[PDB]
Amino acid sequence: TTTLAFRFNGGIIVAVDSRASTGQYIASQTVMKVLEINDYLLGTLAGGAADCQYWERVLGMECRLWELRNGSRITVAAASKILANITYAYRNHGLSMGTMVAGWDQFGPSLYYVDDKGSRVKQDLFSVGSGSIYAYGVLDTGYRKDLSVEDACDLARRSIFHATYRDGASGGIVTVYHVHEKGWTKISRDDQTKLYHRYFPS
Amino acid sequence: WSPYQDNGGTTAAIAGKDFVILAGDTRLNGDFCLHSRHDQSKIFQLTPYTYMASNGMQADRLQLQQMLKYRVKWYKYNNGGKVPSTKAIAQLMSTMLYHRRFFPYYTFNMVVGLDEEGHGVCYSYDAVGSTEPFLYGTRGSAASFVEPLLDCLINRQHMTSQAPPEMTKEETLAMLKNAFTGAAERDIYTGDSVSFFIITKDGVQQESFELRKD
Amino acid sequence: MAETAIAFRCKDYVMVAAAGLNAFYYIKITDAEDKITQLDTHQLVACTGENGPRVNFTEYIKCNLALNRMRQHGRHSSCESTANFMRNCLASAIRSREGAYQVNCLFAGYDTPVSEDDDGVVGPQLFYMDYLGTLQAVPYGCHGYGACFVTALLDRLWRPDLSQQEGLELMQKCCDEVKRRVIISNSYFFVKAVTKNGVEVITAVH
Amino acid sequence: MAETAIAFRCKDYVMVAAAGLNAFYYIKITDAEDKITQLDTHQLVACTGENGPRVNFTEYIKCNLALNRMRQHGRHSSCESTANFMRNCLASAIRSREGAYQVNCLFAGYDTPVSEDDDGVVGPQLFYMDYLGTLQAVPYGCHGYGACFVTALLDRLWRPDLSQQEGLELMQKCCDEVKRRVIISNSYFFVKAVTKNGVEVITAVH
Amino acid sequence: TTIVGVVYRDGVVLGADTRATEGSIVADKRCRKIHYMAPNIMCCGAGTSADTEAVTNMVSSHLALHRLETGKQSRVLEALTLLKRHLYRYQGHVSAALVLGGVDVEGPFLATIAPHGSTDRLPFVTMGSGSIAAMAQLEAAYKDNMTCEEAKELVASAIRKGIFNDPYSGTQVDVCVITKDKTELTIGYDKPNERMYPRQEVLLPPGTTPVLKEEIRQL
Amino acid sequence: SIMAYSGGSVMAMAGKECFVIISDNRLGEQLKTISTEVPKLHVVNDSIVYGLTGLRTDQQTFANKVQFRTEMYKLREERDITGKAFAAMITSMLYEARFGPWFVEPVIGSIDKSTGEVYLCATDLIGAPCEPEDYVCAGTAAESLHGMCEALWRPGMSPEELFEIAAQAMLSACDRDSLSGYGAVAMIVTKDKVTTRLIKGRKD
Amino acid sequence: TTILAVSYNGGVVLAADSRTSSGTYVVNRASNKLTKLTKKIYCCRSGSAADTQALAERVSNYLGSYQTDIGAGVNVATAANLFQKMCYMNRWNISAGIIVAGYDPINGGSVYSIPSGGSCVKLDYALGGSGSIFLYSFFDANYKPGMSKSECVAFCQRAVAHAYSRDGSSGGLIRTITLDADEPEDQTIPWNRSPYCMEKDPKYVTQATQNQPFSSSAKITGNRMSST
Amino acid sequence: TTILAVSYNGGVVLAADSRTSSGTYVVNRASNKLTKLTKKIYCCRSGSAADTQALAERVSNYLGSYQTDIGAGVNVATAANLFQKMCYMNRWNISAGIIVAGYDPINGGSVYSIPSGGSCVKLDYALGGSGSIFLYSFFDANYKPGMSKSECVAFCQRAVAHAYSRDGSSGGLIRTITLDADEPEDQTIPWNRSPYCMEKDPKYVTQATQNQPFSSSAKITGNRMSST
Amino acid sequence: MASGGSVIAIKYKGGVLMAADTLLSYGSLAKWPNIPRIRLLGSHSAVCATGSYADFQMMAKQVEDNIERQKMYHNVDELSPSEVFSYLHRSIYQKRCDFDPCLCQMVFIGVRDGETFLAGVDDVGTRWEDDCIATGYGAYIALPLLRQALEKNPDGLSRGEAMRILTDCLRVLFYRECRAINKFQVADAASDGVRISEPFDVETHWEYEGYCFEKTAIIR
Ligand SMILES: O=C(NC1CC1)c1cccc(NC(=O)c2ccc(=O)n(Cc3ccccc3)n2)c1
C-alpha cells in the first residue's frame, strides 16, 4: 500500500495505489483505498483493509448522525478525533490501520493521520504504507504550497507511481483525489504501468 | 486441539452482463484423509439472486451460512417481504465477519449475484470482511492457480490481439470447467466434482461436472 | 526516549523545552510537534511518548482541570494539586485493564496567590513524573535519550538564581548538547517558560 | 541502516556518498567517520555497518587488491574483478564458522584501458552488494534507512547523462532528503567521485 | 506416495503411484518411483525424494561394483544391509523409506527400510503416505502362493487405494515384477485417471505477446 | 522465507524439438526492489539453459560453481555437457550440500541436438529432480505458473506457439506475485537456433 | 513390545510379542524381536527397532569374530558385557531395552537385563518393553522358579499373552526360543491360539451396563440393544 | 496409590493402600483413601488428595441432603452420577481417579469407575491409582468372579499387596471395607502382615550376582561378600 | 481419557450398519473390553464415537434427553434422524465455540420410513453424509475398502455383502490399529428401527509363511 496526501494552497490532494497483498500473492490489483466518507471528507485505507473499511464506515455514520443531530457538517478535527478515539479505545486489540482524514470544513482544509494506537497527527503532508518510504522521496522534493492543482496532482501521482515501481506491496492503479472548498473530486485513475510509459517514454 | 481445520477445496465465480456463474468443488477433506467426495456445503443460496460460497473450515461456513440465512429472514420480515439485494447481503456479510474479528470464522467467502441493473457481481472476502466487487473471483486451495488464468483470459492485459466479444454464459462456463479441470490436476486438495450454479434473472441452473478423483 | 524534554527552574521562572520530533519507526514525520501542553494559565506539561497516550493523557488532565475550575468559580488549582492529580492518574493506570499511559512528563508551573488569604507557596514549581506515576519535585529534570547528557550539564551549570537571560543561554546549551550527542535528530526544540505573568513561548531558543 | 550510503553513476563519473555518523546505541560519537574507502586509484567502496566488520572487510579487500597488483607488476584489476572478489568473500563468509560480514557496500569504480591491448569496458561501474554477497550492477543504489527515500528520488531525477555539476546538485538533494526524513541524524555526508582521473573528494556536498 | 510390495509364488511384485508433489501441487504427474537397484532387485522409495534418489543410486552403484568383485548376482540382503547401515548412520535425517524387493538364489525377498534404518522383511509391505490405505487392501486380500497375475492385481488394487484416498498419491499405478530370471517393469499397468474434459486450445497466435528486443543466433 | 527473499521465477516448457525457458527480471530484498534488469538465465551451451531461483547470493555462488564444473568438464572431456549429465551433475552438487543447502532451485532446459529430444528438469534445493515432459518451474510465482502452464500448455507446440504461451504464463503469474516481475526474458531453443527475447511487463 | 526371558534348569526361554507400532498404527505385526547373537545366545529387543537392530548386528558381528579368534564357545556374560558397553556408550542417542539370554556350558543358562540406562543386571528372569509393566505382578504372583523347559515355555507364552492383552503397543504372535545344551527350539503362537486374551476370557463377556433404557425405575436391567 | 473395588454376590469390597507421596517422600503413610459418601456408599480416591477430598466432601454433602429429602436410601448410581458430574465439570483443574462403590437394595452392590476424563463406567471391578497398572494382569489371570465376601476381601488384599510391592507410590497399610446388606466391615492389614511382599517372596531371596570376585575363570560363583 | 477407537459404517439397500470394537482404552492401556460403545438414540438412530468417552457420554445423554422430552412433553412425532443429527452437530459446534470441545468424532445412523441416514461429525463441528463413514483409524484403514465396495456395487450393497465388507474391515482394523480388540458390535438400522448385535469376533490369519521365525529374523 502506498497512500499520500498533502495540503497545498489549492486544497488537499490524496493519492493511492490499488494493490492488496496477502504477503507475496496479490489478492487484488483494484482495491479502492480512498474511502469517501461524507462528501467533504475522505479517508485512506492502509493497514488491515477490514479494519479501515469498517471503522471508516463507522466514522461515516458518526459524521452523518452529527449532521442530522446538529444541522451542520462535522469538522475534520472532530471526525479525525472520533476515529482516533476508537483506535485508542482499541489500542490493545491489534487493529492495523493507518489512515488519513482529509477534508475542508469551515476552517479550511485539514489533514490528519490517525493510526491503530489512537495517534492523531495533523501535518501538511503525509504518506502511509509499505511504499511510503519511497513516495516521500519524490514528494518531499517536489512539494511546495504554491503548486497549482495540476502540479499538485502531478506530484501526487508521480510519488505514488515511484512507490509502486519500487515497492513490492504497492501497485496497480494510481488514483488521485482533490479536496477543495466544494467537496472532493476524483481527479484521475491511471494504471501505474501506463504511467511508467508516460513519465519515461524510451 | 485447534478449533480450526482447513477442509480445503476451491470456489470460483465469474460475472457476466446478465448472469453470474459460481462454482465450488465438492471434496471435503479431513486430516490426511477425505471425508466426502460429495459435499455441497460450499455454496449456499441466500436469496434467488444471491449465493455465497465459502472455503476454509466446513464447520464455520455452516454456522456462517445459517447466521446469514436468519439475518436475511429478519430482513424480509422487517421490510415487508422484500429480499435484500446482492449488494446489501454483501455489505451484511462484511459486517458479520468483522463482528467476529476477535474469534474469526475461518471462511473465505464470496457473495455473488445480480446487481439492481441485473448485472452479475461477485464480492470476495478475507476472513474479517475486507471485500470488493469484482467481475470474477476464486478462493480456496486452487485459487492461486485459477485466479491468474482468469486474469489472463478475461482481461488479456498482455495480449496485443484485440479483446474478443463479451463472454456469453456458455463460454464462461466452459472457461470455468477448463480451469477447475486444470486445478484438479495440480492441487491435491481439489478434485472429485464441481457444482456450477448459473444465476440469471430467470432462475438458477445447476450443473455437475466431474473432475479427476485422485 | 527519541524525543527529549528538559526543564529547569530558577527563582522566577521555570523553563521547559521539548523536541519537536515526531517519528514513525525511522521515518521522521516533522520536527515541529509541540509537545509542551499548557494546562492552565500558569501550568504546562512537557510530555513525551507516543501521540496516542500523550494526547489522551494531556487532554484528560486539561479537561479535568478545566472542569474543576468551573465547579470552583474560576479559581486556579495549585501546581502541587495538579501534579498529584496527574500522578494519581498515571499510577491508577498501571494497575488498570488498559495499562500504563506510556508517557513521561515534566510538569512545571508557577504558583501565584489565588486570593488575599492564600498563605501558600509562591513561585516556580517543577515536577518530574514517569509513566508509572513516580512524582518528584526537582530543580531540573529530563526525559529521553538526551536526558542524561543534559542532566549532567545542568548539574554542572545550573544555579538557583539564573536570570531569565542566563536561562535562555543555559537552555540553548542543553538543546545543543542533545543535538550534538543523540543519534536521533532533535533538530528543533520548543521552549516555553512560566513566570508570574503566565506561559511565554520562547522562540530565541530551539 | 543508521548510516545511509548512496551512489550513482552517470556517463563520466560515479559519485558516492555516505553518512559520517558513528553511533553507540543512541550516543552519537561523531558525524565524521569517512566510510568511503578507496581501494585503488579508480575504485572505492562505500561500506556501511559496524566498524568491526566494515574495517576488517575493507582492509582485507584493500590488501588483497594490493597484493595482487604487486604479484602482477603494477597492473590495476578491473572493477568487475574487484567486485566479484568482494562478492565471493562476503558470500563465503555467510557459510563460515565466523559468520556473515554484516556490511553493505556500494562498490564504484571507473575502468580505464589497462594497456594498448585492453578491449575491455571503459567507464564508470557501480555495484550494489549486500552482506550476503548479492552483487548487482546498478546505475544507482543505496543502503540504509534513507535508502528508499533516495532510491525513489533517483528514480525520479537521475538521468544517465548528467554533467558532473548536475550530479553534485542531485547528490545534494539526495543527502538533503536523508536529513529531512530519517530520524537518525545523518548530518554530514562524505562524497567522492570516481572519474577517468581517479577518486576526487567532493567537499561542496555534505 | 504409496509404494507396495508383495511376495508371490515365483517372485516379488512392487508397485507405486506416480504423483510427485511439491508442497500441495503436483510437479510431475508421472514420475518413476520404482528405482533399479540391481538386475534382480528393485527398490521403491518414499519420503524425501532427494534422499531416496541419492541412497538408491549409491547402493545401486556399490552393488554394481561388488558384482564385478564377486562375479555373482547381488543378494537382496546385501542391498538391504547397505541401505540400513547408511540410513542408520544419518539417524533419520536421510528420510528415505524404501521397499526393496528382489529375487536371489535364496528366493524372493521383500523388505522395508525405514528412514532410521530399521528393516522388516515381510511378505507384503507398504510405505508412503498412502501406506495405510494400501496396507488395508493387502491385509484384506493377500494370500500365500499368489500367481503373478493375482499379485499384480492386488498390488495395483492396493496402490489404487492410495491414489484415491491419499492426496499425496496419485495418477497411475506402476508395477515391477521380479522373477529369478528377469525383471519386468510396467509403467501404467493401471491408468484409472484420464482427464474428463478435453483440453481447450486457447489460441495465442504469434506476435500476441509484446516483445521489446530480440536476439537470434544460428548454430 | 529465505527462498523468497530475492524474488524471481523461472519456467521452462517443452514443445516439438524446442523449449522455452523464461525468467522474470526482478531482484529484491523482500518488498524492496533493487533492480528490474536481473534475468535469472544462464546459458551452458547451445543446447542447455538453466535458471536459478532462490536466495540471490546463492544463485550467484552456485551458478559460478556450475560454470567451473561445466568449463572443466568441457576441457577434460572435449565435448559439451548434455542436459542429462548437466542435470545429474547439478543434482549431485546440491545434494553434497544436503545438510546445509544452497538456497536455489534450478530449472534446466535442454535439447539433444541430434534427436531433438527435450529434457527439462527442475530440482528442489537439495537436488531432487522433477523430469516432466511438459513444463517445470520455480520461484516465488511457482503456484501461479503451474496454474497457467497446465491451462495453456499442450503437446507438440512449435517454437512460436510455445513462446506465446510461455510468455502469457510467466506474465499472468508474475502479475499475481509481489516478488516477481518487470517483464521477462525468454530463450527459445531449437536444434538450429537460439532466440532470446525481452518481453514487456508491468512495472509493479 | 513385550519381551521377557526366564531361566530353567539348564537353559533359558525368551519370548516376545510381534508388534512394531508407529504410535497407534501397527507397521509390523510379525516382527521378530528375538535376535540371534550367536548360536545359543539371543537378545530380545525393545525400543527403537532401528537402534536395537543396529546394536544386535554389531554385537553379533563382534561375537562371531571373537568366537573364531578364541576357537571356543562364547559365554553369555561376554555377550551381555558387550551389549552393555554399547548401550552405555550410546545411552543418550538410543532407546533400547535389551535382554541377553542364552546358554553357555560353563554357566548354564543366563539372563541379563540391559535397560535404557545401560545397567546390566544378571537375573533369573527379565522383562522389558512397554508391556512389561503388566507382568511384574504376574510373575510376583504366578511364577515359581525351577520349572521344566516345557512348563517355562508355556508360562512365558502365558505371560506374553497377558501383557499384550493389555498393552496396546504389544500384540500379534508370540515368539519364543529355548536355549540350552540341545538345539534351539523356536516357536510361534499365532494370536488366534493365544493362551490368553480378554476377548475370550469369560469374565469379560458380559457387557458393562452403560446404555440403560429409559425406565420408570432405578433398577438396572441391561443395555438397550434394540429400538423397539 | 492403589485403589480397587470388586463386586461379590450382594455387595462390594473396596481396598486401598495407605500411602500419600509428595513424589518420593511419603507424607502420609496411613492415609484413608476409602471415603464414606453415605452409610453404604464409598469412594476410593486417587490423584490429588486435595481435589478428591474436596469432591468427596461435596458429594457426600449433596447425598445426605438428598437422602433426607427423598426420605429413603441412596442408590449407588446416584452417587456415581454426581461424582461423575463434578469430576467432568472440573476435569481440567483436578487430578482425580474415583471409584464409587457400594450397596443399595434395588441394585445390590455396584462399582463405578470414574477416571480422569470424567467417564463413568459401571463394572464388576475397578482399579485405579498409579498402582493399578500392575493389577490388570493380576485380575486377568487370577480373579474369578462369583467369590464370597471373605474370598473377595482376601483377594483384594492380595491384589493391593501385589500392586504396592511394585509401585513406589503405593505402600503402607491395606484398608478395605465391605459394603452389603449388613453393617460395613472395615479392615486394616498392617504392612508387616501383608499377604504379599517381595521382601519375603522366596524367589527374591537369592541376590543377583553383580559383584563377582576377581577370578581366573568365567565360571560365576556368587557375589563377593567379604574382603578376604 | 478413556477413549474409543474406530467406528465404521456403511449403507446397504434397506439400512445402515455401524460397527465398533467394544473397547475403551486409556492411552495404550486396554482398560475395558466390554463396553457397549454404540448407543441407540430415540427409536430410529444410533450413534458411536471415537475419542473421549466421557465427552461422548455427556453428549449422548444430552441428545437422548432432548429427544425423549421433546416427544413426551409435546404431542409431536419423534425427531427424525437428520433432525437428531442436526441437533448433535449444532451441540458439538457450540462446544467448540466455547473452547469446551466434545473431543470425539462420531458416526450417526438412523432410519425412518426406509429413508436412511448416515453421517459423521467431528470435534470441531465438521459434518458430512456419505454411503460410508468411519472415524479414528477406520477412516484411514477401512474407508478405502468400504469405498471400494460401493464403487463395485453402485446399485447399493445387500445386507450380506455389506456385512461381509464391514467384517473384512474389522479384521483389518484389528490387525493394524494398535488400540483394538477382536470384539465388535454392529448396529443395524432398518425400517423396524435399530438393533445392536451381540459382541462377535472375526477370524484372523497369522500363519503366512513369511511370518515364520526364520524369515523374520534380523540375523542369520
Ligand atoms: O500499512 C501498514 N501496515 C501494513 C500491513 C499493511 C500500516 C499500518 C498502520 C500504520 C501505518 N503507518 C505508516 O506506514 C506510516 C508511514 C509513514 C508515515 O509518515 N506515516 C504517517 C504518520 C504520521 C505521524 C506519525 C506516524 C505516522 N504513517 C501503516
CSV table of C-alpha atoms in Angstrom, one decimal, chain G:
chain,number,residue,atom,x,y,z
G,1,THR,CA,6.6,-54.6,22.9
G,2,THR,CA,6.7,-57.2,25.5
G,3,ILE,CA,10.0,-59.2,25.9
G,4,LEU,CA,11.0,-61.5,28.6
G,5,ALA,CA,13.3,-64.2,29.5
G,6,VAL,CA,13.3,-66.9,32.1
G,7,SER,CA,15.8,-69.4,33.3
G,8,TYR,CA,15.0,-73.0,33.8
G,9,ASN,CA,17.4,-75.7,34.9
G,10,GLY,CA,19.9,-75.8,32.2
G,11,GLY,CA,18.7,-73.1,29.9
G,12,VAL,CA,16.5,-70.1,29.1
G,13,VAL,CA,13.4,-69.2,27.3
G,14,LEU,CA,13.0,-66.0,25.5
G,15,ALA,CA,9.6,-64.7,24.5
G,16,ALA,CA,8.2,-61.8,22.8
G,17,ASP,CA,5.2,-60.4,21.1
G,18,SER,CA,5.5,-59.4,17.5
G,19,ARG,CA,4.1,-56.0,17.1
G,20,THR,CA,6.0,-52.9,16.0
G,21,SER,CA,4.0,-49.8,16.3
G,22,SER,CA,4.4,-46.2,15.0
G,23,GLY,CA,2.3,-44.9,17.9
G,24,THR,CA,-1.2,-46.3,17.2
G,25,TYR,CA,-0.8,-47.9,13.8
G,26,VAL,CA,0.9,-51.3,13.5
G,27,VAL,CA,3.6,-51.2,10.9
G,28,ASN,CA,4.7,-54.7,11.5
G,29,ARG,CA,2.6,-57.3,13.1
G,30,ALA,CA,5.0,-60.0,12.7
G,31,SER,CA,8.3,-58.6,13.9
G,32,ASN,CA,10.9,-60.9,15.3
G,33,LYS,CA,12.3,-59.4,18.4
G,34,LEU,CA,14.3,-62.4,19.4
G,35,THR,CA,17.5,-61.8,17.6
G,36,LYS,CA,20.3,-64.3,17.4
G,37,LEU,CA,23.7,-63.1,18.6
G,38,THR,CA,25.5,-66.5,18.5
G,39,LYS,CA,24.1,-70.0,18.1
G,40,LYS,CA,23.0,-70.2,21.7
G,41,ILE,CA,22.7,-66.5,22.7
G,42,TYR,CA,19.9,-64.3,21.8
G,43,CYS,CA,18.7,-60.9,22.7
G,44,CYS,CA,15.2,-59.6,23.0
G,45,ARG,CA,15.0,-56.1,21.7
G,46,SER,CA,12.7,-53.3,22.8
G,47,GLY,CA,12.7,-49.7,22.0
G,48,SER,CA,13.8,-48.3,18.7
G,49,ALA,CA,13.8,-51.0,16.1
G,50,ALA,CA,16.5,-49.1,14.3
G,51,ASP,CA,18.7,-48.8,17.3
G,52,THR,CA,18.3,-52.3,18.6
G,53,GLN,CA,18.8,-53.9,15.2
G,54,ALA,CA,21.9,-51.9,14.7
G,55,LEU,CA,23.3,-52.9,18.1
G,56,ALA,CA,22.4,-56.5,17.8
G,57,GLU,CA,24.0,-56.7,14.4
G,58,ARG,CA,27.1,-55.0,15.7
G,59,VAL,CA,27.3,-57.3,18.8
G,60,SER,CA,26.6,-60.4,16.8
G,61,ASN,CA,29.4,-59.5,14.5
G,62,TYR,CA,31.9,-58.8,17.2
G,63,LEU,CA,31.0,-62.0,18.9
G,64,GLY,CA,31.4,-64.1,15.8
G,65,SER,CA,34.8,-62.6,15.3
G,66,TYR,CA,35.6,-63.3,18.9
G,67,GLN,CA,34.5,-66.9,18.7
G,68,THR,CA,36.6,-67.6,15.7
G,69,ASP,CA,39.5,-66.0,17.4
G,70,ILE,CA,39.4,-67.8,20.7
G,71,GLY,CA,38.3,-71.0,19.0
G,72,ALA,CA,35.6,-71.9,21.5
G,73,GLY,CA,32.1,-71.0,22.6
G,74,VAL,CA,31.0,-67.7,23.8
G,75,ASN,CA,29.7,-67.0,27.2
G,76,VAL,CA,26.5,-65.2,27.8
G,77,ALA,CA,28.3,-62.9,30.1
G,78,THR,CA,30.6,-61.8,27.2
G,79,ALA,CA,27.6,-61.1,25.0
G,80,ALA,CA,25.9,-59.2,27.8
G,81,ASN,CA,29.0,-57.3,28.6
G,82,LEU,CA,29.4,-56.1,25.0
G,83,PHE,CA,25.8,-55.2,24.7
G,84,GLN,CA,26.1,-53.3,27.9
G,85,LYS,CA,29.2,-51.4,26.7
G,86,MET,CA,27.5,-50.3,23.5
G,87,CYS,CA,24.2,-49.5,25.1
G,88,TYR,CA,26.1,-47.4,27.7
G,89,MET,CA,28.4,-45.6,25.2
G,90,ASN,CA,25.3,-44.6,23.2
G,91,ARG,CA,22.9,-44.2,26.0
G,92,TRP,CA,21.8,-40.6,25.1
G,93,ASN,CA,21.2,-41.3,21.4
G,94,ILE,CA,19.3,-44.6,21.6
G,95,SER,CA,16.1,-46.0,23.1
G,96,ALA,CA,17.0,-49.6,23.8
G,97,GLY,CA,15.9,-52.2,26.3
G,98,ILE,CA,17.8,-55.4,25.8
G,99,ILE,CA,17.7,-58.7,27.4
G,100,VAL,CA,20.6,-61.0,26.6
G,101,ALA,CA,20.0,-64.5,27.4
G,102,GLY,CA,21.4,-67.8,26.4
G,103,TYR,CA,23.2,-70.9,27.3
G,104,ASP,CA,26.9,-71.5,27.6
G,105,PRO,CA,28.3,-74.7,29.1
G,106,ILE,CA,30.3,-73.0,31.9
G,107,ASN,CA,27.4,-71.1,33.4
G,108,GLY,CA,24.4,-72.9,32.1
G,109,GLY,CA,21.5,-70.6,31.1
G,110,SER,CA,21.7,-67.0,31.9
G,111,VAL,CA,19.7,-63.8,31.6
G,112,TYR,CA,20.8,-60.3,31.6
G,113,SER,CA,18.7,-57.3,31.5
G,114,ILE,CA,20.2,-54.2,30.0
G,115,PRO,CA,17.7,-51.4,30.4
G,116,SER,CA,17.8,-48.0,28.9
G,117,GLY,CA,20.4,-46.5,31.2
G,118,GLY,CA,22.9,-49.3,30.2
G,119,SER,CA,22.9,-51.1,33.5
G,120,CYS,CA,23.5,-54.8,33.2
G,121,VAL,CA,21.9,-57.0,35.7
G,122,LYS,CA,22.0,-60.7,35.9
G,123,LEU,CA,18.7,-62.2,36.9
G,124,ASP,CA,16.6,-65.3,37.0
G,125,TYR,CA,14.2,-63.7,34.7
G,126,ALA,CA,13.8,-60.4,33.0
G,127,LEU,CA,11.0,-58.3,31.4
G,128,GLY,CA,11.2,-55.5,29.1
G,129,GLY,CA,9.1,-53.5,26.8
G,130,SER,CA,6.2,-51.2,27.4
G,131,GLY,CA,4.2,-54.5,28.1
G,132,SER,CA,6.5,-55.5,31.0
G,133,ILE,CA,4.8,-53.2,33.5
G,134,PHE,CA,1.9,-55.6,33.2
G,135,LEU,CA,3.9,-58.7,34.1
G,136,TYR,CA,5.6,-57.8,37.2
G,137,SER,CA,2.6,-58.7,39.4
G,138,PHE,CA,2.0,-61.7,37.1
G,139,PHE,CA,5.5,-63.0,37.9
G,140,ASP,CA,5.3,-62.0,41.6
G,141,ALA,CA,2.1,-63.9,41.8
G,142,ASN,CA,2.3,-66.8,39.4
G,143,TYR,CA,5.9,-67.5,38.6
G,144,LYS,CA,7.6,-70.2,40.6
G,145,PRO,CA,11.2,-70.8,39.6
G,146,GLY,CA,12.5,-74.4,39.0
G,147,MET,CA,10.2,-75.0,36.1
G,148,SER,CA,11.0,-77.6,33.4
G,149,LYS,CA,11.7,-76.4,29.9
G,150,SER,CA,8.2,-77.1,28.7
G,151,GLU,CA,6.5,-75.5,31.7
G,152,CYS,CA,8.7,-72.5,31.3
G,153,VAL,CA,7.8,-72.2,27.7
G,154,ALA,CA,4.1,-72.4,28.4
G,155,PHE,CA,4.5,-69.9,31.2
G,156,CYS,CA,6.3,-67.4,29.1
G,157,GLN,CA,3.7,-67.7,26.4
G,158,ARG,CA,1.0,-67.0,29.0
G,159,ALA,CA,3.0,-64.1,30.3
G,160,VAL,CA,3.4,-62.6,27.0
G,161,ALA,CA,-0.3,-63.1,26.2
G,162,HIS,CA,-1.3,-61.4,29.4
G,163,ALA,CA,0.9,-58.5,28.7
G,164,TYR,CA,-0.2,-58.0,25.2
G,165,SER,CA,-3.8,-58.3,26.1
G,166,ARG,CA,-3.5,-55.1,28.0
G,167,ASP,CA,-0.6,-53.2,26.3
G,168,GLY,CA,-1.9,-51.5,23.1
G,169,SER,CA,1.7,-51.4,22.0
G,170,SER,CA,2.2,-55.2,22.0
G,171,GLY,CA,0.3,-57.8,20.1
G,172,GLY,CA,0.4,-60.3,17.4
G,173,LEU,CA,2.3,-63.5,17.6
G,174,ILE,CA,4.2,-64.8,20.5
G,175,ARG,CA,7.6,-65.9,19.5
G,176,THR,CA,9.7,-68.0,21.8
G,177,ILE,CA,13.0,-69.7,21.7
G,178,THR,CA,14.6,-72.0,24.1
G,179,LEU,CA,18.3,-72.1,24.5
G,180,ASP,CA,20.2,-74.9,26.3
G,181,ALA,CA,22.6,-77.8,25.7
G,182,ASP,CA,20.3,-79.1,22.9
G,183,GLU,CA,19.3,-77.4,19.6
G,184,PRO,CA,17.3,-74.1,19.8
G,185,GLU,CA,13.6,-74.6,19.6
G,186,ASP,CA,11.8,-71.5,18.3
G,187,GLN,CA,8.1,-71.5,18.4
G,188,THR,CA,5.4,-69.1,17.2
G,189,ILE,CA,1.9,-69.0,18.7
G,190,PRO,CA,-0.4,-67.1,16.4
G,191,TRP,CA,-2.8,-64.7,18.0
G,192,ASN,CA,-5.8,-66.9,17.5
G,193,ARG,CA,-4.3,-69.6,19.6
G,194,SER,CA,-3.1,-67.3,22.2
G,195,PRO,CA,-3.3,-68.9,25.6
G,196,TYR,CA,-5.0,-65.8,26.9
G,197,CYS,CA,-6.9,-62.9,25.7
G,198,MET,CA,-9.6,-60.6,27.0
G,199,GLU,CA,-11.8,-61.3,24.0
G,200,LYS,CA,-12.2,-64.9,25.2
G,201,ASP,CA,-11.9,-64.6,29.0
G,202,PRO,CA,-15.5,-65.5,30.2
G,203,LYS,CA,-15.3,-62.8,32.8
G,204,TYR,CA,-15.3,-60.1,30.1
G,205,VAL,CA,-18.2,-61.5,28.1
G,206,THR,CA,-20.9,-59.6,29.9
G,207,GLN,CA,-21.1,-56.0,28.7
G,208,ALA,CA,-20.8,-53.2,31.1
G,209,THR,CA,-24.3,-51.7,31.6
G,210,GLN,CA,-23.8,-48.2,30.2
G,211,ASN,CA,-26.7,-47.7,27.8
G,212,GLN,CA,-29.6,-48.3,30.1
G,213,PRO,CA,-33.0,-47.9,28.5
G,214,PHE,CA,-35.2,-45.1,29.7
G,215,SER,CA,-37.2,-46.5,32.6
G,216,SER,CA,-39.6,-45.7,35.4
G,217,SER,CA,-37.3,-47.4,37.8
G,218,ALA,CA,-33.7,-47.1,39.2
G,219,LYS,CA,-33.5,-50.9,38.8
G,220,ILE,CA,-30.7,-51.6,36.3
G,221,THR,CA,-31.6,-54.2,33.7
G,222,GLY,CA,-29.2,-54.2,30.9
G,223,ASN,CA,-28.1,-52.3,27.9
G,224,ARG,CA,-30.7,-51.2,25.4
G,225,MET,CA,-29.9,-53.4,22.4
G,226,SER,CA,-32.9,-52.6,20.2
G,227,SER,CA,-35.0,-49.6,19.4
G,228,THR,CA,-38.4,-51.3,20.0
